[PDB]
Amino acid sequence: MAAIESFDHIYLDLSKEPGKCRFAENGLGWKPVGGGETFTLDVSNIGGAQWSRAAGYEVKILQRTSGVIQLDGFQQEDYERLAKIFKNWYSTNLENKEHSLRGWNWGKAEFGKAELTFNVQNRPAFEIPYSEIANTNLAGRNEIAVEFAPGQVKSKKASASRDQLVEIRFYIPGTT
Amino acid sequence: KRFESYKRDNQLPPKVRDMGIVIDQKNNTIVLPIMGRPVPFHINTIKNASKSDEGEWSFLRINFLSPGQRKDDQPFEDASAHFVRSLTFRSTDGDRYAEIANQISNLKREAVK
């Protein structure tokens, strides 16, 4: 129904400052409280969307090209509005995507379209966007090192926290 | 054998929202901030934790229990399982990371009693 759907207090890609999120038929725009550049995403590059709880709630947007847009700070009540937006405007189902909370460190590391996902019994424990990765190295058998540059390529999401992610190592049998 | 950190989102410690490392001694769990997401790791999954300093940056390396860290044999009932072996964080708070490493080591030792 509405022309614009607006949502307040939303963080874009681990932004330190929240901003205003506006949804329209032709795509989405985010504008920071004062300091920073506005972000835009055309409807033609909206391929999918996931809804889950994060450091409030997060809408993760999957581009038709390889990439992820993270919008968190939504309230739980915001789901039904968002689901209508993505379905009616973006031809997309907003998938409810629960993450694993058991605290296990074994499962499956899967290389998807835009992210390296570690799944625990088919539910994601965490996701690493390819755009954040500085290097991928064989560290032995059967070990792969995924390195970040929080401080060439820069890993902004790795450095958004006070505790900056430097490296993750996976044991993956059968590539040695 | 079977352990479990949390069952529900609302059981996560409230300081999780600051995207920082959180120790939840209560649930035998540490919570690591990965790409905007608070990720729990149970203490029974952890091998050791080490602090180090290079310049103005301090480093926290957590090593996990995994095959090799081979044959034979494993109690995960998942022979082809992939494992998180380790992850490294960096910060300027050298004293905070020293505390974290000690809490984890101290937690681990009860876990192996």
Q: Which residues contact B113 (CB under 8 A, 6 or more apart)?
A: none
A66 and A133 in a single domain? The answer is no
Set of chain A residues whose Cβ sits within 8 Å of the Cβ of B65: 105
Burial, A41: exposed, middle or buried (Cβ in 10 Å; 0-12, 13-18, 19+)?
Answer: middle
A116 and A37 in a single domain? The answer is no
Copy the structure tokens of residue B64.
């996990």
A68 and A26 in a single domain? The answer is yes
What torsion, rounded to 10 degrees, do the Cα atoms A8, A13, A16, A20 define?
-20
Instruction: Give the determination technique.
Output: X-ray
Which residue on chain A is closest to B21 by alpha carbon?
A163
Contact of B85 with chain A, judged by CB distance below 8 Å, is answered with yes
Set of chain B residues whose Cβ sits within 8 Å of the Cβ of A99: 37
Instruction: Choose among A70, A109, A163: nearest Cβ to B91.
Output: A163
The amino acid sitting at B76 is F
A59 neighbors A46 (Cβ within 8 angstroms):
no
Burial, B93: exposed, middle or buried (Cβ in 10 Å; 0-12, 13-18, 19+)?
Answer: middle
Set of chain A residues whose Cβ sits within 8 Å of the Cβ of B57: 151
A72 and A136 in a single domain? The answer is no
Residue A27's SS3 state is: strand
Residue B62's SS3 state is: strand
Domain boundary among A91, A113, A137: A91
Set of chain A residues whose Cβ sits within 8 Å of the Cβ of B74: none
Starting at the edge strand found earlier in the chain, the sheet holding B37-42 runs: B22-24, B29-34, B37-42
Q: Taking Cα atoms as reference points, which of A67, A37, A31 lies closest to residue A49?
A: A67
The amino acid sitting at A146 is V
Q: Does domain B1-113 fall into CATH 2.30.29.210?
A: yes
Residue A160's SS3 state is: coil
Contact of B70 with chain A, judged by CB distance below 8 Å, is answered with no
A129 and A51 in a single domain? The answer is no
Interface size A-B, in CB pairs within 8 Å, comes to 145
Query: What is the experimental resolution, given in Å to one decimal place?
Result: 2.4
Domain extents for chain B? 1-113
Contact of B68 with chain A, judged by CB distance below 8 Å, is answered with yes
